[PDB]
């Protein structure tokens, strides 16, 4: 088990096995308290050194009975992206990385005039999932999301 | 207009954070940069916080009662951690 | 109460400082530490500041007009300088 | 001439004699805007590196046309000192470095029961002056100020 400590001292427990990765811990945290992975900044306690992703937690300073510090970086600044419809026509959308794919699809539905259940969005080959935030996919200013039609 | 749910400990946390905010208003004021409406917001926040610290201190036991001055120090550390996004700024804002 | 007296450009300085204060309220809020009344003070300050930034921008020339987001970055630096009482803090990344 | 720049970006001018010391600059600043020397924190612009006291300003890359940054530290936190009366009896006083010598003398007057015009205070050989702040004299916790009787 692992203690996660937040600013102002709220603490909670995370149990890790059988692998012990930083990406696993972050997914654990999301499930426990709802903070998206892309927003999590984790450091070893009390040293305050940032955890490294590509390194197993056992290989850093962390085993059972250790404490990690979580600071939440909101990452909510507006940016603009492009969604390309099925006809090849790209249109800009103002978004924030903390909004859901579902929310972006409501925007695309409105502009394109296609019901949200009749399409899905992709980015860099992989599907965007309704319940996840845009920040999970690493969208940048004027990245192109593609719209794909269902049957 | 997007609220974030919170537990019991946010009340004490906010008093300390906002004590930190006061300390920065005050330090800014010594730079002769704080305009007149700004100085009213300073004095206002000091009064509200003083009444909030006195209300909170009565509900809590003796060993956890903190004065305005000691709460300022905790808020400053919290603010350092956030401004740099670095717990090392920092460390005691998390309560080790 | 003791007034500290200001001069011209306290007005701009206070908007930037208080933009910095907002940025800290917001960052604190994502830590689930900001209680409900605290979150109201956050949203209240955001609204007032947005109306103050638009009133101030009209009186000033083009080269000095700044949005909420760029004013935040100036206020954060100011806050760093004040939290450490050190001009070198919030210049180019530094620590205690 | 030298430009002093304050936290809000406002600027003013100071002209420096042939000493060109940090202590000289600070005294000019006190005269121009009323901020006591002990409250001044000065740095080179734009590098933000602190000025060093024992080094001449010409030696730190400050000449004519240069800018220094001033941040004011009020230094208002309580401390306790000792004042010794004429009979050899030391007594403790809570003070703040921003309080005036005159104010401290009101405290000593009240406790010792001697009118303030009938005495003066010294510290480390030199007299304390009524209108100056205690921070001028570099008083520490439990420094001993001596009380001297007039005729």
Swiss-Prot record, chains A, D:
This is Ubiquitin-like protein ISG15. Its main location: cytoplasm. It is linked to Immunodeficiency 38, with basal ganglia calcification: A primary immunodeficiency predisposing individuals to severe clinical disease upon infection with weakly virulent mycobacteria, including Mycobacterium bovis Bacille Calmette-Guerin (BCG) vaccines. Patients are also susceptible to Salmonella and Mycobacterium tuberculosis infections. Affected individuals have intracranial calcification. One of its GO terms (molecular function) is integrin binding. The lineage of its organism: Eukaryota, Metazoa, Chordata, Craniata, Vertebrata. The gene is ISG15. Homodimer; disulfide-linked. Interacts with, and is conjugated to its targets by UBE1L (E1 enzyme) and UBE2E2 (E2 enzyme). Interacts with NEDD4. Interacts with PARP12; this interaction inhibits PINK1/Parkin-dependent mitophagy. SUPFAM superfamilies: Ubiquitin-like. CDD domains: Ubl1_ISG15, Ubl2_ISG15. GO terms for cellular component: cytoplasm; cytosol; extracellular region; nucleoplasm; nucleus.
Curated annotation (Swiss-Prot), chains B, C:
Residues 1-87 are annotated as: RNA-binding and homodimerization. Changing residue 44 to A: Complete loss of dsRNA-binding and 40% loss of inhibition of IFN-beta promoter. Changing residue 48 to A: Partial loss of dsRNA-binding and 15% loss of inhibition of IFN-beta promoter. Changing residue 65 to A: No effect on dsRNA-binding and inhibition of IFN-beta promoter. A motif (Nuclear localization signal) lies at residues 44-49. Changing residue 32 to A: Partial loss of dsRNA-binding and no effect on inhibition of IFN-beta promoter. Belongs to the influenza B viruses NS1 family. Homodimer. Interacts with and inhibits human G1P2 conjugation by UBE1L. Both N-terminus and C-terminus can inhibit IFN-beta promoter activation and IRF-3 nuclear translocation. This is Non-structural protein 1. The lineage of its organism: Viruses, Riboviria, Orthornavirae, Negarnaviricota, Polyploviricotina. The chain holds residues 7 to 102 of 281 of the full protein.
């Amino acid at each position: 088990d692992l203690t996660v400590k937040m600013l102002a001292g709220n603490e909670f427990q995370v149990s890790l096995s059988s692998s012990m990765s930083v990406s696993e811990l972050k997914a654990q945290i999301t499930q426990k308290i709802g903070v998206h992975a892309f927003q999590q900044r984790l450091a070893v306690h009390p040293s305050g050194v940032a955890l490294q992703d590509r390194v197993p937690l056992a290989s850093q300073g962390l085993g059972p009975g250790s404490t990690v510090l979580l600071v939440v970086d909101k990452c909510d600044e507006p940016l603009s992206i492009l969604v390309r419809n099925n006809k090849g026509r790209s249109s800009t959308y103002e978004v924030r990385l903390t909004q859901t794919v579902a929310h972006l699809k409501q925007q695309v539905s409105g502009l394109e005039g296609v019901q949200d259940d009749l399409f899905w969005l992709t980015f860099e080959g992989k599907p965007l999932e309704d319940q996840l935030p845009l920040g999970e996919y690493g969208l940048k200013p004027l990245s192109t999301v593609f719209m794909n039609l269902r049957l | 207009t997007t609220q974030i749910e919170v537990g019991p400990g946010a009340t004490n946390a906010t008093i300390n954070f906002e004590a930190g905010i006061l300390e920065c208003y005050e330090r800014f004021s010594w730079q002769r940069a704080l305009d007149y409406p700004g100085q009213d917001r300073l004095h206002r926040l000091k009064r509200k916080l003083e009444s909030r610290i006195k209300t909170h201190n009565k509900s809590e036991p003796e060993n956890k009662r903190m004065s305005l001055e000691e709460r300022k120090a905790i808020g400053v550390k919290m603010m350092k951690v956030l401004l740099f996004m670095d717990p090392s700024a920092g460390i005691e804002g998390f309560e080790p």
